[PDB]
Amino acid sequence: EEDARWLRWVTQQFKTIISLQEFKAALHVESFFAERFFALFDTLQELQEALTLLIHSPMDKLKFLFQVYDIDPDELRTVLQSCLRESAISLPDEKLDQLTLALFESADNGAITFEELRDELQRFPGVMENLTISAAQLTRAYWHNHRSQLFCLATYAGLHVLLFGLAASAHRDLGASVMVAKGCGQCLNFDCSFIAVLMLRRCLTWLRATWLAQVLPLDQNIQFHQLMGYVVVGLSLVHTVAHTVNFVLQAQHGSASPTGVALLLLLLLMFICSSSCIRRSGHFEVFYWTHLSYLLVWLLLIFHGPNFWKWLLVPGILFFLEKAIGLAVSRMAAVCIMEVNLLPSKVTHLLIKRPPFFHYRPGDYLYLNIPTIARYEWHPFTISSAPEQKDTIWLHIRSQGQWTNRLYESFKASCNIKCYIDGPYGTPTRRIFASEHAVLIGAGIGITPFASILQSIMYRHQKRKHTCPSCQHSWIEGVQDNMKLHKVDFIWINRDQRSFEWFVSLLTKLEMDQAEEAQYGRFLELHMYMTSALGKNDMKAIGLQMALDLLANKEKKDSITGLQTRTQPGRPDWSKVFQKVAAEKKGKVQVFFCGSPALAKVLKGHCEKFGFRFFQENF
Amino acid sequence: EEDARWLRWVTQQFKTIISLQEFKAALHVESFFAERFFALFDTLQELQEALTLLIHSPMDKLKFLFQVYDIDPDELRTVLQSCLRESAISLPDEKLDQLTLALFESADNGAITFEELRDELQRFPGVMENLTISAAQLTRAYWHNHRSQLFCLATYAGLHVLLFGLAASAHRDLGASVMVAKGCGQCLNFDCSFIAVLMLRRCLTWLRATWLAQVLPLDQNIQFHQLMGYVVVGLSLVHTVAHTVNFVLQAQHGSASPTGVALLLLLLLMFICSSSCIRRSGHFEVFYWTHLSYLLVWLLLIFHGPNFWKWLLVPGILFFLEKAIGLAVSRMAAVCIMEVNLLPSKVTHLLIKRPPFFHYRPGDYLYLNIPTIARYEWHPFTISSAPEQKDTIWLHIRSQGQWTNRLYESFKASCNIKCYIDGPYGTPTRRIFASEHAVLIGAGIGITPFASILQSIMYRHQKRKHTCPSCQHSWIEGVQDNMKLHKVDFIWINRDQRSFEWFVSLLTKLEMDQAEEAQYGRFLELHMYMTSALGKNDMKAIGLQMALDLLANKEKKDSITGLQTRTQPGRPDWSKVFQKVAAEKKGKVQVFFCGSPALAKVLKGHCEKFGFRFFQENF
Amino acid sequence: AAAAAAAAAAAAA
Amino acid sequence: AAAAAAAAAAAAA
Ligand SMILES: Cc1cc2nc3c(=O)[nH]c(=O)nc-3n(C[C@H](O)[C@H](O)[C@H](O)COP(=O)(O)OP(=O)(O)OC[C@H]3O[C@@H](n4cnc5c(N)ncnc54)[C@H](O)[C@@H]3O)c2cc1C
Ligand SMILES: Cc1cc2nc3c(=O)[nH]c(=O)nc-3n(C[C@H](O)[C@H](O)[C@H](O)COP(=O)(O)OP(=O)(O)OC[C@H]3O[C@@H](n4cnc5c(N)ncnc54)[C@H](O)[C@@H]3O)c2cc1C
Ligand SMILES: NC(=O)C1=CN([C@@H]2O[C@H](COP(=O)(O)OP(=O)(O)OC[C@H]3O[C@@H](n4cnc5c(N)ncnc54)[C@H](OP(=O)(O)O)[C@@H]3O)[C@@H](O)[C@H]2O)C=CC1
Ligand SMILES: NC(=O)C1=CN([C@@H]2O[C@H](COP(=O)(O)OP(=O)(O)OC[C@H]3O[C@@H](n4cnc5c(N)ncnc54)[C@H](OP(=O)(O)O)[C@@H]3O)[C@@H](O)[C@H]2O)C=CC1
Ligand code: HEB
Ligand code: HEB
Ligand code: HEB
Ligand code: HEB
Ligand SMILES: CCCCCCCCCCCC(=O)OC[C@H](COP(=O)([O-])O)OC(=O)CCCCCCCCCCC
Ligand SMILES: CCCCCCCCCCCC(=O)OC[C@H](COP(=O)([O-])O)OC(=O)CCCCCCCCCCC
Ligand SMILES: [Zn+2]
Fold first, then answer.
1. Among A66, A175, A437, B319, whose Cα sits 20 to 30 Å from the Cα of B257?
2. Residues A173 and A287 in one domain
3. At which positions is Ca(2+) 1 bound (chains A, B)?
4. How far is CA B454 from the centre of its chain?
5. What is the DSSP letter of B375?
6. Which chains neighbour A (Cβ–Cβ under 8 Å, 3 or more pairs)?
7. Are B484 and B605 in a shared domain?
């Protein structure tokens, strides 16, 4: 259809004007494809004849493109770049390089020839069909997601209105500038003291395990802290201008005001150094030191706020209790990063040698620390390797910020770095492994625990396949006191596989490893929806990844043919999905969700309709 | 030897005097045995002839005793009672009844006859040899055990001396009766407030998991509380006599003194009702209600002690925080007691139907509550059933007090009672199952967690024995990611099997179930030392128990013959024990201890000498 | 006594 | 460029 429309537009443009510039003007393009096309064609007769051979046979189009670019690794890469409609979801440049190297290598010792490249391409099972062949805000779901964060902000702002009003009411006598100063002061009392508590990452790991994470957001703490910081830096400035306007009106000693100048300067230091520009530049120790002055802001303020010491006492005792409860070897282990693979789309894969007595459940995160990157920063990362894997511990660290970017870009320029992990934290997932026909649903980017969970499911499910050493009558034993599932679905819904190419390759690996066994029964079904690729024609970058993975583990297309038809574009149709889950009879379905709350309620509705036992796992 | 000495003493007594009273006087005895002996003998010739037949053939002695008691269940029981030198360790009366019923039943429809009873006795493999056949404070180890308790008492008494002295020093102005009253008051402030904290059984379950239990005693809390109670009842009486002597000296309004009379009366109520006589009698709700007045003693005292509210505030906030953190269904489960077996020596065996999602590690206790016994009392009990047992949960509840006695004696007069258990608490024992040639050592009565641990070891070790369904080539697979042990010793040292007859039967059961396999390798070795039976002749009550258990599970004596030679009397010889453990090569020995600290240090010495990795498990 | 009834029940059982 | 050297090294490897 597009070829016919292109031909019609060319015929209309030809009748409207052939020079090289006119040809490019008709094509509405600078184009290396256009210049070589002219050089190989060198009139209306020539253009129509060339187009007819180019229009009226995909392999012929690819040969045409080959001769156009023919003027051999770097050139074939440009051919494949020309043969990809990079529209919504894309093939990462690392995977593109791998694909081009795989074609060029198996084809050929120097440059390749298009004739044998043709049969080499036909030899690839899935590269042909996936290479496109051509020449050239307001929703109820939004508020349903953000109602918890909005209620936290509203409680904060309401408490501030309460304190400001109660202070300005009592101090209504003093005129027009002690009201403002007293209001701002009564606010600062609470703002500082409780800007402390947001950083009890020894207590957030405990509150996150409970159901409280479902009601109040526990992952916004760092940026609620950066918000209390800004309100402090605003209210202290208003406090200071109020107390200097008051002294000016008094114009027309004590240790309260000079400590005030000291606090204003210390806060402007903690506010200038805490910007993004200080950690964006590779200064991760300079940020940490200048913030270490929150002690001096907390010291000067005790000698400033006559009643401040109570505020600072309760959260301050909490905070230093925690900072003391954590010492050098509390739960740390100076493990060694064994290998570091830089997966495509800027994600770092760390294999860190497992500590001997390091036992974790699947879906357990850990706080990672790498002194080469940042000496005092502890970021949390989900263990994306099943516990049954005994040698190493995986972590897939997607570049979402300044520390993780530093980790990647530091390894890219270059692997035994010094690493101090901090223990396994996580909700227990034994509800899953004690179930039947679980339906693991996951949405968005919170699926790194599903990597560990699916790998552990598959390890435990292949562990119950015994093979007799004598007569090799391999049978399948029943439940093994650890696992009970008769079936496991997994539905991954995400806008695109942007940083999760490792996850798509993981789902491909699980389907490869249990599609040789699917003739008699299929245990795991791995769905995938993309919700941004409008039509299956757009999900051709994932077909390329799967056909590329089929060549690291040399297998037949029938291994993936199950996953190819469950890798769908656009949103799901939950009616059909749950109804098919119901059509199978493998136990009592127990949906497990890990995603936003609007989708959580949609699924809870459909689930309690169909009679499944919904859950919402918070990992 | 004893027969010859008896004969010599009889010959000497005969030459010193035969009437029935003279015969009893010579025997130094009322004796049903003596009267029948006279009646069957009816002179020096008769006595010597009867003794010669009685002296110069064990079965003949038993037939003699039979004819003596012959004048048939109750009579045979007396025969066996006569044929047992109940000296240091004993055969419990329930086991005696079982033994007599087992003999009488298999022998015979009415009374039994001694002739066939002879061959019936010879048919029992171990009953013959174990039935004796005849006619008739200051040690460094002590302080090493109690140094922690002594340091706790010394810190308490030193803090009291500090408070009393600091109060009587400042108030040295007021004369000779406000010094005493002020000292006692400054003591009461702390005594009440911190008599609270000892009852944070939601925090003791957390402190007991840690290593702090090794340094300070966490099992004396109830009776440190009963000690702070008595010091409060003494100091408040001295406080009151001081403030009445002071007012008498003032003889020669306010709300401080009448609240004083109220506090004195409330404390005398909490002290009269809290005696032992109130819970010894089956009043377990009356004790709980009258103690519920600690609130009113805590109320009146806020209106009494001007500074008391701070003391009461910190531990009082702690205490009510805990009492609120625990609510109706926090971790409770209104399980049903399936069956109740009353094991011998007053121990109750509860099988409580396991809650579906009740997962515990071996060695995990639980707080049991039975409203029929005591409506508000929660006693802790170790789960003595391996987690692999899926149906029920065992608890062996030895009668050591008033609630446990009430439970037993209530079931004895009589089984679906209402039970609200409270969760699994316990230190992780994965150090054991991840080891090789573990040496579980246990001493005293703290071995109920070793029951669960050994049952779980054996379940997991038999789980790795696969049997091919086709050709039945049964092989033994290697480690299964849960268990690694190649060998497991277990040494149980105790003064006697007083309440632990169930444990001796459990060790017998484990040896029966893995002696049918020992022909090629022996996994578990179960030692037993008795440390109060001076010689192996005394450990004949355990031989009877083992020969009785060999007849519930009909087996050959070769099943136990391993355990019979490892069931030794008197203390161990640790040199030989550890040296034999070293002679075997099954990995690196990892001793695990559960017992007193004097023995812990003895074992740590021997262990670090031999090169094993000592532990001290605190369960 | 109690054990006689026990033997009677065991024989009857 | 950089990828040409990569292909050369891969062929040599
Ligand atoms: C349980 C858990 C598991 C996670 N697992 C992964 C994972 O496997 N891979 C991955 O790429 N990311 C993961 N993250 C999120 C995130 O990328 C890292 O945890 C962390 O943000 C890395 O710091 P950064 O320098 O990239 O962030 P920054 O650039 O410093 O900040 C950017 C964003 O990260 C947040 N952030 C910053 N510092 C922290 C911190 N210390 N803890 C949490 N959030 C922070 C900020 O709120 C902001 O949203 C996980 C988060 C949680 C809570
Ligand atoms: C972890 C743990 C596991 C135990 N497991 C068992 C078991 O399996 N079988 C068994 O017979 N005993 C066990 N006990 C000890 C004891 O018999 C019971 O825990 C409890 O004492 C029963 O109350 P009681 O009425 O018999 O005690 P009481 O007659 O009221 O008191 C007598 C003794 O018991 C202690 N005691 C009283 N109340 C409690 C209480 N609530 N908690 C702890 N100690 C108390 C007193 O300090 C005193 O030493 C265990 C104790 C602990 C700490
Ligand atoms: N405790 C809390 O307060 C939590 C809050 N959140 C909030 O979740 C919000 C959303 O994050 P995000 O996960 O990106 O938003 P979504 O959950 O909307 O995106 C998740 C996936 O669900 C798909 N999806 C959404 N609605 C439907 C539907 N009706 N039927 C089928 N598929 C659907 C989306 O596709 P499409 O692209 O078509 O939407 C997207 O691919 C975040 O802003 C965060 O604040 C997250 C976790 C917990
Ligand atoms: N955290 C703490 O503070 C703890 C304190 N304890 C204290 O432990 C004290 C003792 O309780 P108990 O366990 O009865 O005392 P023991 O530990 O002495 O009795 C335990 C067993 O060990 C045997 N035994 C003792 N010494 C030796 C030895 N040198 N060689 C071989 N066997 C030996 C004893 O036999 P014999 O009969 O010959 O002694 C006894 O059978 C209690 O009073 C309690 O206070 C208990 C646990 C921990
Ligand atoms: C932090 C931050 C901050 C800052 C910066 C400041 C700064 C200041 N400031 Fe201030 N304040 C404050 C915070 C603050 N502040 C507070 C919190 C308070 C308290 C208030 C109350 O409490 O009332 C005050 C208070 C306050 C007062 C009162 C007095 C008393 O003591 O009472 C005054 C006068 C002030 C001044 C001042 C000045 C002058 C300044 C500058 C120079 N100061
Ligand atoms: C005074 C008080 C205060 C203030 C004002 C502040 C203010 C602030 N801040 Fe802060 N912080 C703080 C206090 C504070 N702060 C603390 C305490 C902490 C913690 C640290 C640690 O942990 O050590 C923090 C921390 C923090 C962090 C973390 C780091 C990591 O990553 O890990 C961040 C990001 C921030 C930011 C901030 C900002 C932006 C601001 C504004 C200015 N901080
Ligand atoms: C709990 C027990 C107790 C008791 C029973 C008592 C009882 C009494 N008490 Fe007596 N108190 C007390 C505990 C007490 N308490 C205290 C704790 C105090 C405080 C002291 C101070 O802090 O200094 C007092 C104090 C007191 C005082 C002082 C005053 C004020 O407020 O400062 C007085 C006068 C009294 C009296 C009295 C009396 C008269 C009596 C009897 C009737 N004291
Ligand atoms: C005022 C304060 C006080 C006092 C004085 C006392 C005093 C006393 N206490 Fe008493 N307790 C108490 C407060 C008290 N408390 C408390 C709070 C408790 C807890 C209870 C519950 O937990 O609820 C007790 C508890 C108690 C117990 C536990 C019960 C069971 O077993 O579980 C006992 C045994 C007692 C004893 C006693 C005594 C003997 C005395 C002396 C009188 N404690
Ligand atoms: C353990 C403790 C848990 C605490 C939970 C705290 C939950 C609430 C945290 C709120 C943080 C926040 O606003 O998010 C940063 C936003 C971007 O958020 P998102 O849309 O990416 O989710 O970036 C923004 O756009 C911020 C705009 C917010 C402006 C609010 C002004 C409030 C003024 C108050 C004055 C009294
Ligand atoms: C979580 C908190 C943990 C707290 C740990 C407390 C550890 C110390 C508890 C002391 C309790 C105690 O004394 O034991 C009761 C003894 C019998 O003990 P045992 O010999 O059976 O172990 O029975 C007695 O014989 C008691 C005699 C003690 C007399 C002490 C007098 C002290 C007077 C002080 C006045 C200021
Ligand atoms: Zn076989």
1. B319
2. yes
3. 22
4. 18
5. S
6. B, D
7. yes
Q: B376 and B444 share a domain? A: no
Give the integer Cα–Cα distance in Å for A406 and A374.
9
DSSP per position, A94-151: HHHHHHHHHHHHHH---S--HHHHHHHHHHSTTHHHHS--------HHHHHHHHHHHH
| One-letter amino acid of B468 | C
Question: Coil, strand, or helix at residue B568?
Answer: strand
Residue A540 within a domain: no
Distance CA B345, CA B398 (A): 8
SS3 per residue for B421-449: EEEEECCCCHHHHCCCCEEEEEECCCCHH
| Residue B526, φ and ψ in degrees, nearest 5 | -110, 105
Question: Which of A357, A431, A468 is nearest residue B471 as measured by Cβ atoms?
Answer: A468
Would A343 be classed as within a structural domain?
yes
Range of the domain at A469: 430-532+570-616
Q: Which two tokens stand for residue B199?
A: 């009852």
| B209 and B188 inside one domain | yes
Whether chains D and C touch (3+ CB pairs under 8 A) is answered by no
Q: End-to-end CA distance of chain B: give it in Å, rounded.
A: 47
Distance CA A2, CA A5 (A): 5
In 3D, which of A537, A596, A576, A573 has the Cα closest to residue A130? Answer: A537
Instruction: Name the experiment that determined this structure.
Output: cryo-EM
Q: Which two tokens stand for residue B534?
A: 């001076």
3-state SS, B231-247, equals HHHHHHHHHHHHHHHHH
Residue A514, CB-side half-sphere exposure with 13 Å CA sphere: 23
3-state SS assignment for residue B399 = coil
Q: Are residues B380 and B444 in the same domain?
A: no
Is residue A590 within 6 Å of ligand 5 at its C-beta?
no
> CB of B485 within 8 A of CB of B582?
no
d(CA B549, CA B319): 49
Q: Is residue A459 a contact partner of residue A386, using CB atoms and an 8 Å limit?
A: yes
Indicate if B313 and B410 belong to the same structural domain.
Answer: no
Note the ligand closest to the C-alpha atom of B268: 8
**Six-digit token string for A256:** 């309260």
Contact B192, B301 (CB under 8 A): yes
If one counts the domains in chain B, the total is 4
Task: Give the Cα separation of B70 and B65 in Å (integer).
Answer: 8
What is the distance in A from the centroid of ligand 3 to the CA of A598? Answer: 7
How far from B212 is each of A357, B144, B216, CA to CA, in Å?
21, 17, 6
- Give me the amino acid identity at B279: R
User: Which strand ranges, in their side-by-side order, compose the sheet holding B567-568?
Assistant: B567-568, B524-529, B488-493, B438-443, B590-594, B615-616
Sign of the torsion angle spanned by Cα atoms B495, B500, B503, B507 = positive
The reply to whether B126 falls in a domain is no
**Order of strands across the sheet that contains A615-616:** A567-568, A524-529, A488-493, A438-443, A590-594, A615-616
Say which amino acid occupies A263. L
**Contact status, residue B128 vs residue B109, Cβ threshold 8 Å:** no
- The backbone torsions φ and ψ at residue B528, rounded to the nearest 5 degrees and listed phi first, read -160, 120
Resolution in A for the shown PDB structure? Answer: 3.2
Helix pair B597-610, B574-583: axis angle to 10 deg: 40
Output the ligand 6 site: residues, CB below 6 A. Answer: A 192, 195-196, 199, 222, 225-226, 229-230, 232-233, 270-271, 274, 291, 294, 297, 377
- Whether the CA torsion A514, A518, A524, A529 is positive or negative: it is positive
User: Which residues, numbered 510 to 569 in chain B, qualify as contacts with chain A under a Cβ-Cβ cut-off of 8 Å?
Assistant: none
- Per DSSP bridges, beta strands B567-568 and B524-529 are parallel
The two tokens of residue A268 are 């402007």
Q: Is A434 close to B357, i.e. CB distance below 8 A?
A: yes
Q: Which of A273, A300, A325 is the endpoint of a domain?
A: A325
A482's tokens? 């650890």
- Give, for ligand 8, the residue of B205, B225, B295, B304 to mutate: max count of ligand atoms closer than 8 Å to Cβ: B225
